[PDB]
Amino acid sequence: VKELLEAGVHFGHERKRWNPKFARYIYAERNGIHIIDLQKTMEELERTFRFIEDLAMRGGTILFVGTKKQAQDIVRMEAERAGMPYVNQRWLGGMLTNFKTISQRVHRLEELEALFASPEIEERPKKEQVRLKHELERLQKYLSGFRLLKRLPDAIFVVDPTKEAIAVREARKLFIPVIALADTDSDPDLVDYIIPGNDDAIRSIQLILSRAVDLIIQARGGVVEPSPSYALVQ
RNA sequence: GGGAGCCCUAGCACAGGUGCUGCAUGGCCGUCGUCAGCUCGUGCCGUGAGGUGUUGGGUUAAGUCCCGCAACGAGCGCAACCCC
Ligand SMILES: [Mg+2]
Ligand SMILES: [Mg+2]
Ligand SMILES: [Mg+2]
Ligand SMILES: [Mg+2]
Ligand SMILES: [Mg+2]
Ligand SMILES: [Mg+2]
Ligand SMILES: [Mg+2]
Ligand SMILES: [Mg+2]
Ligand SMILES: [Mg+2]
Ligand SMILES: [Mg+2]
Incomplete structure (x- = not known):
């Protein structure tokens, strides 16, 4: 439940098909690619993980939505790890x-x-x-x-806001808080709790949902070990 | 001397009418057509009439099945259940 110089290689992503609304979270145009403001990714993470804590504590569910294939399998394990439901194939x-x-x-x-x-x-x-x-x-x-869902979830975790934007829209219309793993192609303001990382590339993706589910278990009551995925991401 | 009943005149209340109206009608039938279609609930889009679903690609005798998809389903049809 941390890591700051887990830039690793999962900091910046995407070229110039950006949403200019994502301008604050960017560092530079290092050779055709916006790289994500490293600090902000960590401090948005602060206020974000904070949110999710109180959700596990109060005993509510988080619907993990990831349809993008480069994240598809990862969703399955980390969502199965925690009790929470997932939408995996299509939405x-x-x-x-x-x-x-x-x-x-x-x-x-x-x-x-x-x-x-x-x-x-x-x-x-x-x-x-x-x-x-x-x-x-x-x-x-x-x-x-x-x-696994018997009623509407208290929040919802999407791995691509842009791509699963029907998922996002539905959440809002029912006032369900959106957690999202976002980057330069998305509308940040459409999201309540943002982890400005990058929707694509498993090295990110899993790192995020690992640490997130770590935190969900850690706060529910179970304090556990490595994940079914981890470096089994090739 | 009256009475039930049945055959009976003379008047009543009615019968009866294949007389009109099939645009006043029920019922049943013909027909497009045994063609593969016509709709609904809820969601979503649209100020609205409405749209999506039922469009797209493959397949079938067939909205027959498959893939896909802001839709998820369902009803009347198709098929099957009956007969030779
Ligand atoms: Mg994308
Ligand atoms: Mg008459
Ligand atoms: Mg008639
Ligand atoms: Mg037929
Ligand atoms: Mg015939
Ligand atoms: Mg219009
Ligand atoms: Mg409306
Ligand atoms: Mg049509
Ligand atoms: Mg078709
Ligand atoms: Mg059918």
Whole structure:
């Protein structure tokens, strides 16, 4: 739960497709790439991790949203490590603003797996058997850890604001605090708690969600060890 | 001398009408068409009528199934359940 000269190589990123609104968090245009104000990344982190502490203490959940493939797997472990839910494959229209209706898909998954521990997987025609077993396929594929959500989450952790911007918009419309791993292509003001790092490159990404989940466990009550991911990021 | 009932005149209340209106109508039928379509709930977009979903790419006899996607689903159809 720290590291400051964990610039490592995960400080600055992105070329000139910036959101000029991200101007404060930049250090220079070192050869076609804005590099991120190192200090600010650490002090925004201060007020940020602070936020997340009180969330684990009060016993609420954080929905980890990362769809970007260069961060996809990482989300799965760190979100499984902590109890919290994750949206991993792709983000659906109304996971939040339509959160009731979307949860029928959860009502079915949990209940369709109950078909697969019964005598009725031998019963039922195979007209149903083929359809109703490759339907369970897809369900577990998108809601592999949305099903953990039983109500709207107290906050939400996105790894790319720009890319998962439908996720962001939904959060706001329901007044759900946005934590985000952001960099130069994003609108910082659209985000409540910003870690101005860089949405792409696993060396960042995982470092952040490691230390974040470290802190979540550390503050919930468990004080643990290295992660399932770590330097298993190639 | 009256009475129930049945056959009966003479008047009543009504019957009956394949007389009109199929644009006053129900019912049933023809037809586009056994064509693959027509909608809904909630969400999202839009001042609004409305839109998205139902568009895109592949496939099928088929909105048939697949991939994808601000949508996630569902109903009436298709298919199947019936017969030869
Ligand atoms: Mg990006
Ligand atoms: Mg008459
Ligand atoms: Mg008629
Ligand atoms: Mg047909
Ligand atoms: Mg015919
Ligand atoms: Mg307009
Ligand atoms: Mg409106
Ligand atoms: Mg259309
Ligand atoms: Mg198509
Ligand atoms: Mg169909």
